[PDB]
Write an enzyme that holds these catalytic residues in place. Structure first.
Site, PDB file in Angstrom:
ATOM      1  N   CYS A 121       0.833  -1.211   0.000  1.00  0.00           N
ATOM      2  CA  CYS A 121       0.000   0.000   0.000  1.00  0.00           C
ATOM      3  C   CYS A 121       0.874   1.271   0.000  1.00  0.00           C
ATOM      4  CB  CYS A 121      -1.015  -0.013   1.133  1.00  0.00           C
ATOM      5  SG  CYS A 121      -1.920   1.542   1.346  1.00  0.00           S
ATOM      6  N   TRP A 140      -1.207  -5.264  -8.262  1.00  0.00           N
ATOM      7  CA  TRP A 140      -1.731  -4.636  -9.482  1.00  0.00           C
ATOM      8  C   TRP A 140      -2.359  -5.591 -10.473  1.00  0.00           C
ATOM      9  CZ3 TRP A 140      -3.111   0.147  -9.593  1.00  0.00           C
ATOM     10  CH2 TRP A 140      -2.487   1.044  -8.714  1.00  0.00           C
TER      11      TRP A 140
END
Length: 211
Positions: free
Chosen positions: A18, A205
């Site tokens: 993150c 991702w």
């Protein structure tokens, strides 16, 4: 001092990717604050976490009182007030520096049609950041690292790793001030200690790129 950060995708006992959680961790690391890191698997959130973050969001910070704080912008300001030394204060004038780079990177990364203007929009934001860094470098503020760098650094790391992996795209050699900056930022002890492993940033991702 305690902070709940995102765990790695597929590795719940490993630090995740993150960028906002990394900004909090970079702040704690630069300020040399002792802290407990609590890893949160966002795909299977536990009960203790859902009690302190009902919206189920990370990072969430605790200064000493059992009052959990959300939003990495509020969190880093709270750390700066309670632990003012050593200084990470960025002059308000340079607060917005490089802010459009991350969403433009995400837009270009998710793009499957090369004929759109997503590559150009991102190049423009990077060209504008190189301009700031040539006139005010090596970092966003002076010769010293500051809050804004701990916000942008992780965002630029995602841009670097993800765009290299998914599109074979790299920041042009033309932007020397940007390269000098990423090379300096990424090699800092705090960054080396809090960055996700390449594998975990890609695993983060991959489902978003393919959706």
């Amino acid at each position: 001092v305690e902070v709940c950060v995102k765990a790695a995708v597929g590795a719940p006992d490993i630090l995740g990717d993150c960028p906002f959680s990394q900004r909090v961790l970079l702040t704690l690391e630069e300020k040399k604050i002792t802290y407990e890191m609590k890893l949160v698997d966002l795909s299977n959130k536990p009960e203790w976490f859902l009690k302190i973050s009902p919206e189920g969001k990370v990072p969430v910070f605790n200064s000493g009182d059992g009052k959990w704080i959300a939003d990495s912008d509020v969190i880093t300001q709270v750390i700066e007030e309670k632990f003012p030394t050593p200084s990470l204060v960025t002059p308000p004038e340079y607060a917005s520096v490089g802010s459009k780079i991350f969403p433009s990177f995400v837009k270009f990364l998710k793009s499957k049609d090369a004929s759109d203007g997503s590559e150009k929009a991102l190049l423009d934001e990077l060209q504008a950041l190189d301009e700031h860094l040539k006139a005010h470098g090596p970092y966003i503020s002076g010769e010293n690292v500051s809050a804004a760098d701990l916000s942008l650094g992780p965002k630029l790391f995602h841009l670097q790793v993800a765009l290299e992996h998914f599109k074979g795209w790299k920041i042009p050699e033309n932007l020397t001030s940007v390269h000098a900056y990423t090379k300096a930022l990424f090699s800092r002890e705090s960054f080396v200690k809090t960055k996700p492993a390449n594998q975990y940033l890609i695993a983060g991702w991959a489902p978003k790129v393919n959706a």
